[PDB]
Write a protein that binds this ligand. Structure first.
Ligand SMILES: Cc1cnc(-c2ccc(-c3ccco3)cc2)n1Cc1ccccc1OCCCCCC(=O)O
Ligand SMILES: Cc1cnc(-c2ccc(-c3ccco3)cc2)n1Cc1ccccc1OCCCCCC(=O)O
Lengths: 243, 253
């Protein structure tokens, strides 16, 4: 409860764009095509260009999630090396869980909420830049059906970072014990914050396995791009993660 | 990295302090200043007042067996708090323990040994090596090479904190037969061995060559245990009325 307050507080300190802020906008400049895209920017091609904007957004979200993890209690007392592994395998599951907050069925907020880019447009991109995008929308649309708010998400995101099964963890039991607290606070929080909704906690535990699968298939698609899109550059911060 | 290695060592040392009833520090204070057992008479006096059948050589062998079963139990609890030991496959745990306990047991046995004998029954007995030599073959023979190993090992003057990491390196051995995730085991061992190199510079700053010296003792320990296991084979073969504890049967199987 206090613990949940504190993670919420940390979430607010660290993420410029909260679901709260995002929902109030979604109910910005549309970008539904080439002309609109080009106007918004007022190079290789439109697709690789959109991909570079994805990369720019992911990079920044890694930075935020990195500062955020510093506030999850005991995270800072893990081996430095365990910290890095937790961040490495988890940031993308967190990044895709938080994507739901800025997405609706028709598209997503960009540039701090000033823009909206239609899901139509992103589908129009040539393969495989279309295929790496659309599966996130399918996930985000369902996730949003759970109607979580920011306070819930702050715990959700922390539970994802503190996952016991990452490859190469030295102290699994310690990481697991921190997560178990996070998961307990989260159950407690959902009872209190969503008391008439029913079965939310284990629906959320399932979403965590849905994301793990989503990031598997994303990593899968990224390495295909790493080869087949010979001329497409990848931010070095994103090279370590995919290494 | 440097700060993680320190903390990893400290974790291994705490696991050690919590799991072994007898540390070298305690053993050394007892040895330097128990009831001395040096003959049949003092032996029987001990089974009557140091409480903790067939013939003397076999009775001694049984007590050797009771103590090693107990140390195997402590080593299993110890390994449970070696960081990453408990999230290995359950079959890798059992395998690491089955092939490594004896190496760990004869490493640590140096802690409770001097050239004249060793502590028994948590430091309340001392059995002289002369008495153990006087036992009949093959029992006297399975004993004396551990003393020879222990005397030279003690000359390296390790302490508990060094030993905790040395023992962990013996348990987390990548080379044991029939492991499922060899690369994972090898990764933990390498981390243990880096932590060890670092801890020795810090704990033994004037000792030249101490780390490669310990890698060699690890080689010598493997040969000692091979030789030990051949002898246990010969005893199973030739001493038919002598029994072996079922925990030890599983290991030797
Ligand atoms: C998570 C996110 C947040 N914001 C954006 C975003 C930003 C600006 C644009 C835009 C389009 C036209 C101009 O700008 C599109 C998406 N994304 C990206 C994204 C949203 C939905 C589905 C999939 C996505 O990325 C998949 C590729 C990520 C590659 C790098 C990596 O693996 O790390
Ligand atoms: C490791 C240890 C620790 N303490 C003792 C100990 C205990 C009590 C007596 C005692 C003699 C009279 C009354 O009690 C002697 C030795 N040992 C045993 C031992 C110490 C030195 C050399 C060899 C040894 O074992 C040889 C047989 C091991 C068989 C079991 C197996 O393979 O697993």
């Amino acid at each position: 409860k206090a613990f949940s307050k504190h993670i919420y507080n940390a979430y607010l300190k660290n993420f410029n764009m909260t679901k709260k802020k995002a929902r109030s906008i979604l109910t910005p400049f549309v970008i539904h095509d080439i002309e609109t895209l080009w106007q918004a920017e007022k190079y290789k091609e439109i697709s690789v260009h959109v991909f570079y904007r994805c990369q720019c957004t992911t990079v920044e979200t890694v930075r935020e999630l990195t500062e955020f993890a510093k506030s999850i209690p005991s995270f800072s007392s893990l081996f430095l090396n365990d910290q890095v592994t937790l961040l490495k395998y988890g940031v993308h599951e967190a990044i895709f869980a938080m994507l739901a907050s800025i997405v609706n069925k028709d598209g997503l907020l960009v540039a701090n909420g000033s823009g909206f880019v239609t899901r139509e447009f992103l589908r129009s991109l040539r393969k495989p830049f279309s295929d790496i995008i659309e599966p996130k929308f399918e996930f985000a649309v369902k996730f949003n059906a759970l109607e979580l708010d920011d306070s819930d998400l702050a715990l959700f995101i922390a539970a994802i970072i503190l996952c016991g099964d990452r490859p190469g963890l030295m102290n699994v039991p310690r990481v697991e014990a921190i997560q178990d607290t996070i998961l307990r606070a989260l159950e407690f929080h959902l009872q209190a914050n969503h008391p008439d909704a029913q079965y939310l906690f284990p629906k959320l535990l399932q979403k965590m396995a849905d994301l793990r699968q989503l990031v598997t298939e994303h990593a899968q698609m990224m390495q295909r791009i790493k080869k087949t899109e010979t001329e497409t550059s990848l931010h070095p911060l994103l090279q370590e993660i995919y290494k």
